[PDB]
Amino acid sequence: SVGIVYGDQYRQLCCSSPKFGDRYALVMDLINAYKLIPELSRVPPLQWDSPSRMYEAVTAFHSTEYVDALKKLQMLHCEEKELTADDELLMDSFSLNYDCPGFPSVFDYSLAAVQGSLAAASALICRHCEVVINWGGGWHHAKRSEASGFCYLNDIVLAIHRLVSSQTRVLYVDLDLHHGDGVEEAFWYSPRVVTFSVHHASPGFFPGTGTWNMIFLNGAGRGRFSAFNLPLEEGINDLDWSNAIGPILDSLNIVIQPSYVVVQCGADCLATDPHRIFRLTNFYPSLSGYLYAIKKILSWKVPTLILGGGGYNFPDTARLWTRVTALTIEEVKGKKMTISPEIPEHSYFSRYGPDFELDIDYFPDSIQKHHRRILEQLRNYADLNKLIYDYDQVYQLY
Numbered sequence: 327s328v329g330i331v332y333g334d335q336y337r338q339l340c341c342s343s344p345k346f347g348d349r350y351a352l353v354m355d356l357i358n359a360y361k362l363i364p365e366l367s368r369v370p371p372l373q374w375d376s377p378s379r380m381y382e383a384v385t386a387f388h389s390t391e392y393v394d395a396l397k398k399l400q401m402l403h404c405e406e407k408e409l410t411a412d413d414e415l416l417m418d419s420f421s422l423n424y425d426c427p428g429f430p431s432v433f434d435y436s437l438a439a440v441q442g443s444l445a446a447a448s449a450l451i452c453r454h455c456e457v458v459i460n461w462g463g464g465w466h467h468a469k470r471s472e473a474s475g476f477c478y479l480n481d482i483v484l485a486i487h488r489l490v491s492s493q494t495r496v497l498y499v500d501l502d503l504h505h506g507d508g509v510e511e512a513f514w515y516s517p518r519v520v521t522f523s524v525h526h527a528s529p530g531f532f533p534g535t536g537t538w539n540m541i542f543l544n545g546a547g548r549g550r551f552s553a554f555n556l557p558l559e560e561g562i563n564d565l566d567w568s569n570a571i572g573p574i575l576d577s578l579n580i581v582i583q584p585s586y587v588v589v590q591c592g593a594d595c596l597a598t599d600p601h602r603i604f605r606l607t608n609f610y611p612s613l614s615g616y617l618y619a620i621k622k623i624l625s626w627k628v629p630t631l632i633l634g635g636g637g638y639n640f641p642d643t644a645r646l647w648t649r650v651t652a653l654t655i656e657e658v659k660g661k662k663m664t665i666s667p668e669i670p671e672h673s674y675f676s677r678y679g680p681d682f683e684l685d686i687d688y689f690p691d692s693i694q695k696h697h698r699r700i701l702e703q704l705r706n707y708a709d710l711n712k713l714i715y716d717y718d719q720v721y722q723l724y
């Protein structure tokens with residue numbers, strides 16, 4: 327059974343932000359136009375018995391004062407009056423400004439993603455679903471008391487917390503163009519949540535972490551060697567990115583033997599993304615880096631959580647996420663998903679112009695040193711955590 331987080335109020339809430347606009351609606355409607363909905367099990371978003379219950383759930387990671395400030399920000403944006411100098415300072419102290427401004431539904435919008443990823447983690451725990459997808463989730467940059475990189479509430483950290491607290495080990499894989507710092511930092515001291523982020527890293531590029539510092543940091547305390555990072559130069563194509571990540575993915579599975587896999591699948595690595603950093607596609611034959619990674623992760627047969635994230639080219643993010651969805655049905659259920667190369671007719675068809683095709687409109691030594699560093703980190707992680715593994719079978723992957 328493959329699960330997908332959806333709801334009528336959920337769709338309205340995921341579409342209420344000025345940054346992401348109607349992206350969620352485009353993703354969900356392309357999946358629906360492609361006749362994928364009957365193949366999926368709708369996972370309804372989590373709801374709470376009272377306000378105190380909701381607060382208890384969000385504050386398992388986030389500070390109460392931050393949740394209070396984010397709710398007060400929604401309230402203030404629902405009134406015409408401008409903010410007092412004191413309310414501006416208060417918001418500035420939580421970084422509820424710039425990339426993370428207020429808007430009339432800021433709190434409902436960010437809580438919705440938590441509701442979706444928590445319900446997704448639950449459907450995996452009760453074994454109702456083998457895999458759950460949440461294209462409204464994947465807000466990897468949010469910190470305990472700080473909004474960051476368009477992320478207010480870290481739905482990933484909360485989903486992972488619900489999974490570990492259900493020895494349970496979680497492997498978190500972050501495919502987004504940006505370093506998955508919020509998730510990495512949340513589990514920095516815990517060996518049970520191994521985080522792995524592949525991303526672009528360059529001087530002045532957000533967030534600045536997931537690369538060499540002032541050395542390469544990798545966790546602290548009993549969590550030492552438990553945070554993995556692969557920073558990549560701009561211009562990487564599907565094949566080089568796949569070859570860079572592949573042996574790493576397989577080796578992490580063999581050594582960690584995770585109980586759950588949590589995959590943030592941010593679509594900002596696409597060649598057609600306005601960032602224009604990585605040259606990844608959504609091509610399925612010349613295979614998409616995202617599709618190669620997902621297929622590899624699903625072949626392990628470990629309960630998996632697939633989440634969204636970045637992706638600023640809404641129709642292209644929808645084309646990728648629609649293919650990831652179809653691949654998951656095929657990999658989990660074993661039934662072929664024949665997806666037409668032409669966009670089917672639906673209310674959002676005009677957005678796929680001027681050609682209306684499924685493929686994105688695109689024509690296509692440092693890694694070896696990173697592989698040797700990561701292999702040694704993995705061995706140190708295994709030694710510290712008294713994990714039994716065959717050194718050679720893991721070395722041979724690289």
Ligand SMILES: O=C(CS)NCCCCCC(=O)Nc1ccccc1
Pocket residue numbers: 424425426467475476502504532592594635636637
């Ligand atoms: O795309 C992501 C998340 S997957 N992160 C990119 C980093 C955010 C960019 C920094 C920023 O603060 N931008 C900004 C500044 C003022 C107003 C609006 C946006």
Ligand SMILES: [K+]
Pocket residue numbers: 500501502503504505506523524525
């Ligand atoms: K990433």
Ligand SMILES: [K+]
Pocket residue numbers: 513514515516517518519520521545549552553
């Ligand atoms: K960790």
Ligand SMILES: [Zn+2]
Pocket residue numbers: 502503504592594635636637
């Ligand atoms: Zn991103």
